[PDB]
A paper describes a structure:
Recently, a selective thiosulfate uptake pathway involving a membrane protein [name] ([name]) in Escherichia coli was characterized. Here, we assessed selective thiosulfate transport via [name] [name] in vitro and characterized E. coli [name] ([name]) as an adjacent and essential protein for [name]-mediated thiosulfate uptake in vivo. [name] is a cytoplasmic protein that belongs to the TusA (tRNA 2-thiouridine synthesizing protein A) protein family. Finally, the crystal structures of [name] [name]-[name] fusion proteins at 3.34-Å and 2.60-Å resolutions revealed their interactions.
We succeeded in crystallizing a fusion protein of StYeeE and StYeeD, designed based on the amino acid sequence of Corynebacterium pollutisoli YeeED, which is expressed as a single protein. First, because a comparison of StYeeE/D and several YeeEDs’ amino acid sequences revealed that C. pollutisoli YeeED possesses the shortest linker, of 40 amino acids, between its [name] and [name] regions, we prepared the fusion protein by introducing the 40 residues between the C-terminus of StYeeE and the N-terminus of StYeeD. Second, after attempting but failing to crystallize the fusion protein, StYeeE-StYeeD, we tried crystallization using alanine mutants of the conserved cysteines in StYeeE-StYeeD and succeeded in crystallizing StYeeE(C22A)-StYeeD. However, the resolution was insufficient to reveal the details of the interactions between [name] and [name]. The asymmetric unit contains 2 molecules of StYeeED, Mol A and Mol B. In the crystal packing, StYeeD in Mol A is involved in interacting with an adjacent [name] region, but [name] in Mol B is not. Each crystal lattice in the datasets was the same, except for having slightly different unit cell dimensions. C22 of StYeeE is located at the interface, implying that C22A affects the interaction. From our X-ray crystal structure, [name] and [name] appear to work as a 1:1 complex.
Residue numbers in the entry:
A (entry chain B), B (entry chain A): 1 to 329, 372 to 450
Write the structure that this text describes.
């Protein structure tokens, strides 16, 4: 039942597409823009998968296989992967679904990510991976209806508690925090509440179906890409994860075209290709070193309550923060217009607020943008700045105009 | 002596850079625009290498190693490789040296050209190659000071003659043809005559130095790429032609910057990356099938007088001609302006011809270009149409204004 990875992955892309689900931007905007929309989306799913993974394993739909603990691997590979995120312009999974979105930079970013991961795994970088392998923590769980034989450590296994107990506690706390905290609001119809339900459901669909083929794990990104490159370059048979990668690329493309969001897109300056190639290049090193990326360790490993995924997840954000500071330091009169068409995700938001605050009272400020997400984030980032959005105007195919009524 | 190829390639890039020597355009412009500048550079070098190769074989610096004849592989793969040339925006070595210039579409084309060649060699296309290999002609020469043991057939070996005779007859006919024939004029200072001298001197240096490494051949491009990818993705040792692949890029990189020609380049519309993406794939499949590319069979094999290299070099032009039809079917007032900045070199020349033809007597035509070659090819294409070029201007570094006074 190997084709089911394409089936799971096809749903995976559509959830990631219409839900804007990118983990690198989620970590960045709690540090840059104090924006938590995608964190509650993460926290909600993680809580739901916590109960889901144990519940599905309890009945007999899966067994959990936590990743083995490697402090040198989880810490250092976690940080290397965090750097690649901001350099690659998106997470490991985010770039993959971005390929079907028509992002030439995502093609370039994905091309090196698989190659470097291949090189880190078996290629010329295999010395650095084999050296880190001398820090493998031998601590293990034992075979049960919960855990595969010889798997890694968990919160439960250390504590001697039955896995239900921390899973019910932590998920409830997360559900409390996400439901009890103020949220920065956008205008995505596939809002973070329902979107987390689908994301956890597909993950549960991922675990049960992938285990049938022989792969005892949920959603993964690095393992599939390496399997794709191998099959194309050494004629090895494709498996569930590589097919899942294929379904993701198709899945994001289908919805992007149905919504009318699809476009072959170029960066504003040609130097960005050199940047995003390095970004994925780092990600291949870090993801392979840590044993998984923002999906293989975070989305699918954190709700499994596994120490190795929990430890590796930490430095995903440290690198996400580290590379962020290095890098990111109708007739309506219009008083000043600023053109941000062709700019990557944070730029339209960054220069829109730089216009209204460096403007007097009563200014009409025009914002010209050609990317879908920015027309939903800009209206919120100006309401707290006192001002008001006059009208969101639809100009050319895929371009929107925002007129701002500046206050004080 | 593996390192000598980076040196040979380093010279190779500078020769290819300042002479603009791309074989895909050499074949293309004899059918499109009846322009023979680059073919003149080709035929002379073939003659010079016809004499050079046999001369060095006589003393003991080298031996000729013609590639064995396979009628299925040379014809079909040669045709397909010709399709990939036009699609990939240039020949096999024609993108590689262009990587050092700063062209992002060549980086994309290089990514698919290498990976397809690795796939067609041992990856997912090994079935096609394994089937094609059953048609290998068992005609072999014998170990001698002129031919390596069990090599392929040649014009000389077929006729029962000494290698000097066909080399001295065919090269003189090439030399007589090139010098007695009309040549389309350019303003490349590194003219076709001297550049043909240096291109054989590098080619001969490639033979003598590489033969000591254990590879008994001169400049070969597709074989070089696979050695790099094997090393990077399988931790295999690099080799002479793998280093030669690097030296071409590093050699052109030095030459592209000193002349002030370096610039990170993007196409006009994002669609070109997918078009050039297929081009590298076709070239990899074609070059591995053909057993040699624009350099492996034409530049290096044709002067060796080998039957297989001639046969594949016939169909390189047929596929080049096939795909060419599918794809291509200051105070000066200025009366009409034409902007072709960012479009590949044929387009500025063609769109400059379209303006003058659809212009009346006395109109001043402004043509803005951002590629150095077009500022050389346009002035000859304007005097051919009766008109006169007024001044070549320097707007921005790397951008030129061409002012044309049209006659009738
Ligand atoms: C603030 C949160 C709001 C929502 C809250 C939802 C709570 C759901 C579960 C809680 C478990 C609490 C601890 C229960 C301990 C039970 C121990 C047990 O059954 O066994 C103990 C021993 O280890 C073997 O017998
Ligand atoms: C017990 C086995 C399962 C354990 C795991 C699942 C736990 C689900 C519940 C968590 C808290 C949900 C309610 C959180 C508060 C929601 C409403 C809110 O934010 O405040 C409303 C206010 O308290 C009044 O008006
Ligand atoms: C645990 C067992 C699970 C078994 C079942 C597995 C699959 C579950 C859900 C899949 C939803 C896939 C489609 C999600 C919705 C598509 C996107 C959407 O809602 O788009 C709205 C649009 O953006 C408005 O403008
Ligand atoms: C063993 C001895 C024989 C084997 C080795 C023979 C090497 C022959 C040439 C090497 C590099 C030539 C590079 C091209 C010349 C310099 C670049 C040039 O021509 O630049 C002109 C410029 O464009 C004006 O503005
Ligand atoms: C990892 C590298 C992956 C590389 C490949 C990723 C997927 C590319 C998908 C679509 C582009 C081709 C279709 C869109 C072409 C431009 C749109 C257009 O002009 O119209 C097309 C439409 O079909 C009316 O004819
Ligand atoms: C027990 C589990 C309970 C939950 C199981 C969920 C399974 C998936 C169902 C629906 C996906 C989301 C569908 C709704 C998303 C928004 C659709 C919408 O607004 O559509 C607008 C329209 O397409 C243009 O105007
Ligand atoms: C479109 C681009 C996504 C990648 C598509 C190609 C990825 C590699 C597929 C591959 O390995 O194909 C060979 C075959 O699977 C050996 O059994
Ligand atoms: C991995 C292998 C499978 C490839 C996926 C296709 C990805 C792209 C999705 C399809 C392109 C959609 C498209 O071009 O839509 C028309 C466009 O809007 C112009 O009219
Ligand atoms: C091998 C097993 C099969 C694998 C392959 C199956 C392909 C099925 C195709 C399409 C269905 C899903 C289409 C989902 C389209 C996105 C939803 C959406 O956005 O539509 C509403 C719109 O946005 C409002 O403006
Ligand atoms: C338009 C441009 C056209 C350019 C020219 C294209 C010529 C045909 C090329 C490839 C198809 C090959 C199909 C047949 C392949 C071999 C059939 C066969 O017997 O394959 C056995 C197999 O390899 C083990 O079982
Ligand atoms: C053995 C190599 C001989 C090379 C020289 C061949 C004869 C000179 C060429 C004259 C062309 C006509 C010029 C007018
Ligand atoms: C035994 C054989 C030994 C062979 C050893 C190598 C011989 C060839 C070396 C150089 C050729 C000329 C190179 C190009 C020189 C002219 C460049 C030109 O046209 O102009 C350059 C000038 O700097 C513009 O300002
Ligand atoms: C796997 C294969 C790897 C192959 C690797 C080969 C070596 C590196 C290649 C080319 C370097 C080219 C460098 C060109 C630098 C140009 C700098 C320049 O001119 O920059 C202008 C700018 O204005 C300044 O601020
Ligand atoms: C002035 C414009 C250019 C400025 C500089 C641009 C960057 C140069 C860096 C490296 C180039 C490659 C050469 C150095 C490395 C060669 C490969 C090597 O070390 O090979 C070892 C061994 O022979 C096989 O593994
Ligand atoms: C491994 C690290 C490598 C670091 C980098 C090493 C650079 C070597 C320097 C010079 C060789 C090439 C000399 C220049 C050849 C082309 C000259 C040129 O541009 O000729 C036109 C002329 O300048 C118009 O006035
Ligand atoms: C293997 C590839 C090695 C690549 C090594 C770096 C190449 C030059 C990079 C940046 C300079 C950009 C300068 C600004 C744009 C051109 C003017
Ligand atoms: C031998 C297998 C491939 C043979 C056929 C090549 C297919 C891809 C390119 C077609 C033209 C696309 C651009 C058309 C522009 C008008």
């Amino acid at each position: 039942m190997i084709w089911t990875g394409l089936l799971v992955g096809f749903l995976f892309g559509i959830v990631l597409q219409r839900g804007r689900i990118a983990f690198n931007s989620a970590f960045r905007d709690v540090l840059l823009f104090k924006d938590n929309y995608l964190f509650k989306l993460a926290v909600f799913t993680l809580a739901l998968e916590m109960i889901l993974f144990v519940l599905l394993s309890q009945v007999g739909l899966m067994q959990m296989n936590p990743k083995p603990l490697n402090l040198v691997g989880n810490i250092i590979g976690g940080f290397v992967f965090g750097l690649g995120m901001v350099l690659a312009g998106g997470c490991a999974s985010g770039v993959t679904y971005r390929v079907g979105e028509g992002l030439t930079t995502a093609w370039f970013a994905a091309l090196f990510y698989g190659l470097g991961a291949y090189a880190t795994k078996s290629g010329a970088f295999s010395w650095w991976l084999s050296w880190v392998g001398q820090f493998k923590s031998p601590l293990s769980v034992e075979e049960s209806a919960y855990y595969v034989k010889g798997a890694g450590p968990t919160i439960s296994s250390v504590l001697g508690l039955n896995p239900w107990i921390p899973a019910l506690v932590i998920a409830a706390l997360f559900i409390l925090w996400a439901f009890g905290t103020k949220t920065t609001s956008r205008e995505t119809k596939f809002n973070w509440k329902i979107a987390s339900v689908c994301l956890a459901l597909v993950a549960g669909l991922g675990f049960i179906t992938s285990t049938l083929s022989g792969r005892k794990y949920g959603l993964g990104i690095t393992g599939g890409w390496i399997n794709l490159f191998q099959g194309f370059l050494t004629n090895s048979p494709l498996n569930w994860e590589g097919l899942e990668i294929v379904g993701i690329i198709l899945g994001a493309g289908v919805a992007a075209a149905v919504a009318g969001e699809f476009k072959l897109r170029m960066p504003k300056n040609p130097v960005t290709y050199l940047q995003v190639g390095i970004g994925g290049l780092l990600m291949g090193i870090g993801a392979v070193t840590a044993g998984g990326c923002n999906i293989g360790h975070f989305l699918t490993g954190v709700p499994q309550l596994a120490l190795s995924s929990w430890l590796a997840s930490i430095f995903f954000i440290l690198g996400n923060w580290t590379m962020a500071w290095i890098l990111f330091r109708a007739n309506y009169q219009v008083s000043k217009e600023i053109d941000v068409r062709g700019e990557v995700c944070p730029i339209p938001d960054v220069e829109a607020k730089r216009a209204v605050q460096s403007a007097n009272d009563g200014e009409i400020i025009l914002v010209r943008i050609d990317y879908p997400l920015s027309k939903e984030r800009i209206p919120e980032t100006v309401k707290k700045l006192g001002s008001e959005v006059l009208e969101i105007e639809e100009a050319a195919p895929g371009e929107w105009n925002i007129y701002i009524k500046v206050k004080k």
